[PDB]
Amino acid sequence: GRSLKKGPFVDDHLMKKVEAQQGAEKKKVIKTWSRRSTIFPSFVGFTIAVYDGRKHVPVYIQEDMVGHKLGEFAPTRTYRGH
């Protein structure tokens, strides 16, 4: 998969927002279009409203969720059955 040398990936604007909110007693929702961002241990404890193609779905971060792309946690399309 992702080359180890390149290190983990995350959008700079999203990274800046989380860093500014790090010293926050109560984390506020972070509205992002960035599906590409990988989740980080620092990201733990936050709720991120990730765009799903038509709206930002909030998703809560936790230690288990770290290490995966944000966009995965927000399904794009809806299918109920036939």
Partner: protein, 114 residues
């Protein structure tokens, strides 16, 4: 026998070890190399001391119930976080990016002609 699974007796030792869950052809060759046992000799001819050494190698390995619990823990982990992968597991659909308009029988199951 080795880890609680009666490996075939007449077959060659390499294939008999593969019959162990969690051990493929590559791992079987590796453990036989470690133990010094020839790959051709059948298990029914393998001496007890060879079996003890092979058991020691496998004990060092992680296989069978241990491996199944580990992999199922990962799948359970996906589902519990509720990832896209977890939902794929939940609904029995291809998780690695396959198309589903056709095929996908392996994950979906048998055809429902409706």
């Amino acid at each position: 026998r080795i880890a609680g699974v009666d490996i075939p007796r007449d077959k060659r030792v390499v294939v008999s070890l593969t019959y162990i869950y969690g051990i493929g052809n590559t791992t079987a060759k590796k453990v036989l190399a470690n133990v010094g046992v020839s790959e051709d000799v059948r298990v029914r001819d393998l001496t007890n001391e060879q079996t003890d050494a092979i058991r020691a190698e496998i004990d060092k390995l992680k296989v069978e119930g241990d491996l199944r619990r580990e992999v199922n823990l990962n799948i359970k982990r996906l589902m519990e976080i509720g990832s896209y992968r977890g939902i794929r597991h939940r609904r029995g659909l291809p998780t690695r990016g396959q198309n589903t308009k056709n095929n996908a029988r392996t994950r979906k199951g048998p055809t429902k002609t409706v």
